[PDB]
Each structure stands twice: as C-alpha cells, then as structure tokens.
C-alpha cells in the first residue's frame, strides 16, 4: 500500500521557523520525484514545489522560495520543508504528494497524497472565549423555536459546546469557527419547542481546555 | 501571474455525463501543460485522477476521462456516482511551476434538495456593554452544500466586516454553515434594519430585523 504521513506541524509564532517531514512507505521512494502542496483554511490548493529523486533539480513556486526550503533523504525515505520566516498566511494543511510519471517520459500525475499536517502561525496568547446568548429579536411564533450561543474570541482552538450540560443533543449544530481580529469564533444553536422555551431554562456550556475554563450562559429573551 | 480558472460549482445526478472545465490566463490550454486533475473527498483526502490531459491515474474508475475542449482542460464523468460528489481541482504546467484552479463543487444529488433554515440573532445586551455588536446569521439542514450569503444594513450590502463558513456536514447528511456581521456598538445604535439574505439553487431565503 502507498502510504504517507507527514509530521512537525503545530503553532508557530511569526518570524519563527519549523521543519515538516513526510514519509513515504509502500514504494520505492528513491524512484519518484515528490511535491509539497498547501490548502489554507476555507481556501483552495497552492502548490509550493517539487524536487527530483536524485536532488539535483527543483521547482518552486516564486513567491515562497524566500521562505521554505524542499529537501529529502532517500536513505530515510522522507522529504521535508524548512519553514523560516513565517508569516499568518503560512496557518494552512501542508500535503506531500507523490509524481507519477507515465510511460513516454512526458506525462504525470500527482496519484497519492498524504493526510496533511496542520501549520498555525500566530502571535495570540491563550484567550479564554466571550459567551453571549443568541436569542431571537423581541417576536414571531412558529411551534419551534431556534437559539444559540455565540463563543467569541478565544485562542486556541478548539472549544467545546453543549446544552444543558449534555441533555439536550438532537438538532444541535456547532458551526466550523472563523478567525476575527487574529482569534476564533464560533457560534452553535439549538432548537425547541416554543412552549418549551422560555418558560423552561436553556444553557449553553463552554469548555476551553487552554485555558482550564468553562462556563455557562443562560438563554434570556430580549 | 498565471491564473487558473475552474467553475465554483455544477450539479449533476447518479447516471448522468458531467464535464468540468480548467481555464488559463496565458491562451489556450495545451498538452504542454500536463492538465493534472485532483479529487478532494471529505476530512481532506486528495487523490490523482487524471494526467498530462488524459490519462487515468493507475486504477482510476473507466468512468473518468479527460480532454480539451476548445481553449480548455476537461475532465468527464460519463455515469456520475454518488461517490464521486467531491471538490476537482485542475492544475496547469507553466515549464517551471504549477498553479492550481480554485476548485469546482461537484454535487451529485443523492438526496432531495432541501432549502436552507435561515435564522438572524440581534447582538446580546451584553456584548453591546463592551463596545461591539455581532450578529449571526445560521444556516442550515439545505443541499446542495453550495449557498452564497450577503447582508445589508438600511439598504446598504455589506463590503467590511462580514465572514462566512464554507458549507459543512450535518449528521443527517445535509449542509450547515454561519455568517458573521462585526459592527461597533455605535454602528448598530445608529442603524435600523439589519438583513441576512441566503441564495440557494437560485432562491433568496431573507431574514431581517428592525433594532430597538
Ligand atoms: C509538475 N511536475 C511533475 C514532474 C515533471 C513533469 C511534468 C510533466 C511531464 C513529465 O514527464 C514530468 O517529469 C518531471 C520533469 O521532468 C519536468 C517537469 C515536472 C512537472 C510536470
């Protein structure tokens, strides 16, 4: 079987450096040229560049040599990027990706590619998140009714929500956070029954394993 | 500054024929650019699928070919699975680099369509006490997970401060996704009428409300 799996990814702050390696099991390695591939958070693939088995030729996207550096060791079956110098816009899933070269010596594929490992370049300190109740504005009926809980501003991911403590579970979503002002946000809901709520109680709990906290907020109507 | 452009998404349904596109800023697409196509399936697993134009990767399903069709790179499903519901990106050989497309949406419908459950939350009272106002807007239980989102306060679309997830998997199978609207705390006292709007399969799901 193919088979990749990179490693040393992990928070980073800027102008740091950190050193990613994929291995390479299932073929014999020392016979492929091997790529290195990004995708940042909502974002597409952006290729960073490839090296030959043998070293002697690389390519490279422009914008990026400045920064990384691509290499490999056959003898250990690995290829690696050197991450100097970073920046926000290095926070992304880095892949290794396997060339495929076809017979006639004029065509490729990228056919098999590592799971990824997750790079974080930030300067945030452990911030514990601001819970705010999402109730709905003062006032419509329908037989059920949807709230929420707004988690606003914490480092590092991840949170972790619940209502009433667990008991509440079906139609629960929680929302993938986005970053605002270099910290996350994220958002879940919840729906009931509209004679169930507010004449019963209904609250969202916060866990933020960094910071040791979690808390709770009840959902008050407006 | 070589661009590759793909469409952002296409529906099609199981038993169907489907071709996506690859486009480059430079001229037509040749096979000195080794049309390379990529699947993207969920928890991020990539896979190679097609090659220098068109060549299955080793072991890829009958069902995938590729080509040129005019300017362009082109890669067919004849007989779409509902497997092969996925993200396809396209990349082009420009003689030292490569440079991907952003990516095509292929759905290929394996449930109803479902419209999306739209629901607008006003900021807490208690965040408006520090100065800023939030508010979300949440979407979910639609398929296709393809939606564009835009907000308008008194009438005027929002261009700053608004931010939205990527479509994400419910546990019944359909799509979720939040927006975010950051004002300050003076903004939302000095505006009225407040408006998330949600296109879905070419319909505008619209909630709004008035402050105070
Ligand atoms: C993306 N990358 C893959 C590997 C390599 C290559 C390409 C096409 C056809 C090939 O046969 C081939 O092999 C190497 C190299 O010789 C030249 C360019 C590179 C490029 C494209």
């Known amino acids: 079987e193919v088979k990749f799996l990179e490693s040393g990814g992990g928070l980073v702050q800027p102008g740091g450096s950190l050193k990613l390696s994929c291995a390479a099991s299932g073929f014999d390695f020392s016979r492929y040229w091997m790529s290195w591939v990004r995708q940042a958070p909502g974002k597409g693939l952006e290729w960073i560049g490839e090296i030959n088995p043998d070293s002697r030729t690389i390519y490279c996207t422009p914008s990026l040599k400045d920064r990384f550096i691509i290499s490999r060791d056959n003898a250990k079956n690995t290829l690696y990027l050197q991450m100097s110098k970073v920046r926000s816009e290095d926070t992304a899933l880095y892949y290794c990706?396997?060339?495929?070269?076809?017979?006639?010596?004029?065509?490729?594929?990228?056919?098999?590619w590592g799971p990824g490992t997750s790079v974080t370049v930030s300067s945030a300190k452990t911030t514990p998140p601001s819970v705010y109740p999402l109730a709905p504005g003062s006032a419509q009926t329908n037989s059920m009714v949807t709230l929420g809980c707004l988690v606003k501003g914490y480092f590092p991911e991840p949170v972790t929500v619940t209502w009433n403590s667990g008991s509440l579970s079906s139609g629960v979503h929680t929302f993938p956070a986005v970053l605002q002002s270099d910290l996350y946000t994220l958002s879940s809901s919840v729906t009931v029954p509209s004679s169930v709520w507010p004449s019963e109680t209904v609250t969202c709990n916060v866990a933020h394993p960094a910071s040791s906290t979690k808390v709770d907020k009840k959902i008050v109507p407006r | 500054q070589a661009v590759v452009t793909q469409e952002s998404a296409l529906t099609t349904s199981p038993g169907e024929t489907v071709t996506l596109t690859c486009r480059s800023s430079t001229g037509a697409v040749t096979t000195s650019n080794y049309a390379n196509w990529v699947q993207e399936k969920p928890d991020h697993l990539f896979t190679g699928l097609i090659g220098?134009?068109?060549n299955r990767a080793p072991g890829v399903p009958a069902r995938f070919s590729g080509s040129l069709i005019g300017d362009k790179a082109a890669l067919t499903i004849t007989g779409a699975q509902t497997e092969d519901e996925a993200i396809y990106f396209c990349a082009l050989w420009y003689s030292n680099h490569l440079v991907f497309g952003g990516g095509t949406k292929l759905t290929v419908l394996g449930q109803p369509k479902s419209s999306p459950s739209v629901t607008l939350f006003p900021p807490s009272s208690e965040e408006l006490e520090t100065n800023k106002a939030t508010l979300v807007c949440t979407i979910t239980d639609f398929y296709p997970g393809v939606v564009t989102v835009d907000w308008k306060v008194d009438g005027t679309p929002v261009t700053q401060g608004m931010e939205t997830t990527q479509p994400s998997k419910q546990s019944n199978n359909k799509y979720m996704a939040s927006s975010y609207l950051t004002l300050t705390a003076r903004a939302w006292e000095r505006h009225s009428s407040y408006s998330c709007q949600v296109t879905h399969e070419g319909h505008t799901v619209e909630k709004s409300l008035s402050r105070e």
């Open positions: 220098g134009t068109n």
């Open positions: 990706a396997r060339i495929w070269i076809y017979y006639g010596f004029d065509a490729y594929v990228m056919d098999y």
